[PDB]
């Protein structure tokens, strides 16, 4: 028995299987930032900090003695609750195949958006810095019309080539930019093919961020340390509802500051 306390919930095995399948299917679609960064294997719930390797000077305990203190990055935990109806839970054993899992889908969407925002733009409250605020290249503004994106992509590629960064290049775009690209010309495919023609990678859709960016997936530039992966826990229940939650714990680090180019939203 662990902290999740799953056995105390009045939920059948088939309902648990269906809920797990739905949650996994939703997370695999709404988890975007995990595909472009290095992800380590889970290390357990006892992980608290990751050493950076740097030190800071200290005054000194006694005369003739000098002291330094190591620097670390902390681990942060996220939890999102939701509620499920007991009638829908019980109908699974009766033979239902269309039970309502919309609150679970919404919770998965929220946790995925939170993780993506934390990775891409940082979490100042927890002391975690993002990739875009630490990027050292010159940001480029996106054009108003969808027909002028390839020249900006080419400018970003030129910046990367001048800086000297190799690897397959991937373009991450926000919802507004993705819709602007898709809803133009003959369905947006000629623009899509132009972008995939300049860059060997694939355009990635990220709903939780604004603007966009271009990065490389050569490896060794972004590290994500995961203590506990996304899991389901049990809080309480009433005569008609059961409250559950999703939880995870991780930390993130961006090593190379010249491997990405920031794309600001159009004016």
């Amino acid at each position: 028995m662990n902290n999740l306390h799953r056995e105390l919930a009045p939920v059948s095995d088939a309902a648990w299987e269906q809920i797990e399948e739905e949650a996994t299917r939703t997370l695999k679609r709404f988890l975007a930032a995990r595909r472009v960064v290095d992800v380590t294997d889970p290390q357990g719930a006892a992980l608290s900090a990751v050493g950076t390797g740097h030190v800071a000077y200290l005054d000194g305990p006694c005369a003739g003695v000098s002291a330094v203190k190591r620097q670390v990055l902390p681990v942060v935990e996220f939890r999102v609750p939701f509620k499920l109806t007991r009638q829908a839970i019980d109908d699974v054993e009766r033979g239902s195949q269309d039970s309502d899992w919309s609150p679970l889908k919404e919770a998965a969407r929220k946790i995925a958006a939170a993780e993506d925002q934390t990775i891409f733009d940082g979490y100042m409250a927890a002391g975690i810095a993002g990739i875009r605020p630490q990027s050292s290249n010159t940001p480029l503004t996106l054009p108003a019309t969808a027909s002028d994106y390839p020249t900006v992509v080419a400018q970003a590629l030129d910046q990367l080539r001048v800086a000297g960064v190799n690897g397959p290049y991937h373009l991450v775009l926000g919802e507004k930019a993705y819709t602007s690209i898709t809803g133009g010309n003959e369905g947006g495919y000629p623009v899509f093919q132009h972008i995939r023609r300049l860059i060997d990678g694939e355009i990635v859709w990220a709903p939780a961020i604004e603007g966009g960016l271009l990065l490389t997936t050569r490896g060794g530039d972004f590290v994500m340390d995961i203590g506990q992966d996304i899991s389901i826990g049990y809080l309480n229940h009433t005569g008609t509802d059961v409250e559950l939650y999703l939880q995870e714990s991780f930390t993130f680090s961006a090593l190379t500051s010249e491997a990405t180019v920031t794309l600001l939203p159009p004016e």
Binding site: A23, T24, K28, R34, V39, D229, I232, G233
Partner: peptide, 10 residues
């Protein structure tokens, strides 16, 4: 228990 294995989505 309840891991919900996702890992890397590469």
């Amino acid at each position: 228990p309840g891991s919900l294995n996702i890992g890397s989505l590469k």
